Design a protein around this ligand. Structure first.
Ligand SMILES: CC(C)(O)CNC(=O)C[C@H]1CN(S(=O)(=O)c2ccc(F)cc2)c2ccc(C(O)(C(F)(F)F)C(F)(F)F)cc2S1
Ligand SMILES: CC(C)(O)CNC(=O)C[C@H]1CN(S(=O)(=O)c2ccc(F)cc2)c2ccc(C(O)(C(F)(F)F)C(F)(F)F)cc2S1
Lengths: 286, 283
């Protein structure tokens, strides 16, 4: 169906995925859990909007069958709005370490300069996390099934860009190979801030895009999936728009309530690329 | 009507109840929680019948709910035990404080103070838990903490039957506190030397309770109330004997009791053998 170069490209991405994506969250342990001025007011009013827009309940299923469940608090008008942030900080960081490992194991990425690698990971980390999270998303129950951990959502949610993305991507019933090809397309994005070898990255992305188009023609019937490829490219455009939204969101919260882990500060630009990104450089050279 | 001596007696117990019973459970903190041989066949039969889910409401409105694991079998049946022991110890410390602020109890030799406390701790705890028990939901509403029952099968557990039965009488605060005093001043407890004084004390609290009822409960619903309460107390003594035996069987195959519980229950001269009690009674 596809060429041998195309089959081997997929095989490389699928290997990279099986090796670095802990699908059952079996190594995500020792994480934190929620406990048992005119200019500043404008900041707090905005941050309150950023957080109350997405509400989930936590479910922790014990090995024995015991179930711990965390229902979030209402906006009383204080710090309670930040109860889930250290837990989300640990979850994001775990997910990011997986994504750095994923990129690192790909030859086309490994063969790029360290500075380009850093810039590509800074620009794509969140996007790759969401695509990965989409694979554990249950659209019937409104839940992300993260092994023993579950995140249960509480047309009200269909307005929230992040939620509409998960519901829509899940609707496409994508294959493991298609999710992984979406990951490469997003990772090898030439238009990222700080990318030097723009030409090489553009030729790499186009080859991943061609392989995805070719994979759809060979593996899917006629013609229900006629525009599946273009539907996928639309989702990635939307994903990049949610990424810009999410960076402004995170930075605003970080500004009034510091919560990001050391790796999150590096990825998001919270206070010479190798000098400003020492954790990332270590992780890439391991 | 009530005599001046009876009115003062109620007043004192009521004042002792408020000083020593934190009904909102606001000072209950730093407690353990479940993690995020034919004796085993009997110990499992003790634990299984008393199945509860735990709820924790934060000041913010946030709620942590714990659903327990099923049997077979398996050390998972001992999940709520460290927590239960922390809650018990906290209640027993309030019961100890309750006894201490009572003049009638203070004027007793330290050995009898220990003997009465060892005999009544569980009984007084059960009486105080009944006041926070909601019979409509089967929940002990202990402030931020809630213990919810997971039917004729539920009623097969005497401790659980006692709670529904006692709640049906719809007792006043004065009646609950007089029951505590009657159960505390039990002359028949092991090691009680001052039998006569304790028995005289018990008869005056029982007389005070009878007088309180005649003076305040004239409704047909409350006919025979005094004798029902007295039958409930005898029933509470029976449950207490069964509970001590259940605890000793659980502790033997799975040690969980705090140092105060080991003292109160016997788990291993009176003042030396009960150092913590002796300290608490002096402090
Ligand atoms: C008043 C309250 C209690 O309602 C406030 N809302 C919450 O505490 C919801 C949590 C969960 N979510 S979420 O609902 O958007 C979500 C949950 C699970 C998922 F897998 C994906 C999204 C989330 C996601 C990212 C992020 C972050 O990326 C963000 F803070 F946005 F930067 C983080 F990981 F860095 F923290 C935060 C949250 S907070
Ligand atoms: C398999 C599982 C997990 O279902 C086993 N069941 C439980 O762990 C339920 C607990 C709670 N109860 S209870 O349900 O009877 C109860 C709960 C709240 C109350 F305020 C009163 C009783 C209890 C009571 C005494 C006692 C004890 O007195 C003793 F017995 F043991 C203790 F507190 F010292 F521990 C134990 C329990 S165990």
């Amino acid at each position: 169906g596809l060429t041998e170069e195309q089959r081997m490209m997929i095989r490389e991405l699928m290997d990279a995925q099986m090796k670095t994506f802990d699908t059952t969250f079996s190594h995500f342990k020792n994480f934190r859990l929620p406990g048992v001025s005119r200019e500043e007011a404008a900041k707090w009013s905005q941050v309150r909007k950023d957080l109350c827009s997405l509400k989930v309940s936590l479910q922790l299923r014990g090995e024995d069958g015991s179930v711990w469940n965390y229902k979030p608090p209402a906006d009383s008008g204080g710090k309670e709005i930040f109860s889930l942030l250290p837990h989300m900080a640990d979850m994001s960081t775990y997910m990011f370490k997986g994504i750095i490992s994923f990129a690192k194991v790909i030859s086309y990425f490994r063969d790029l300069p360290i500075e380009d690698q850093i810039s590509l990971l800074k620009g794509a980390a969140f996007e790759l996390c969401q695509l990965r999270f989409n694979t554990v998303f249950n659209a019937e129950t409104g839940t992300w099934e993260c092994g023993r951990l579950s995140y249960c959502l509480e047309q009200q949610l269909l307005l929230e860009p992040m939620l509409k993305f998960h519901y829509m991507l899940k609707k496409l019933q994508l294959h493991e190979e298609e999710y992984v090809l979406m990951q490469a397309i997003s990772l090898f994005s030439p238009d990222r801030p700080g990318v030097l070898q723009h030409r090489v990255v553009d030729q790499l992305q186009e080859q991943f895009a061609i392989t995805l188009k070719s994979y759809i023609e060979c593996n899917r019937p006629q013609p229900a999936h006629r525009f599946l490829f273009l539907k996928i490219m639309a989702m990635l455009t939307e994903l990049r728009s949610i990424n810009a939204q999410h960076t402004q969101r995170l930075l605003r919260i970080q500004d009034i309530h510091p919560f990001a882990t050391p790796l999150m500060q590096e990825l998001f630009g919270i206070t010479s690329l190798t000098e400003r990104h020492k954790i990332l450089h270590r992780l890439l050279q391991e």
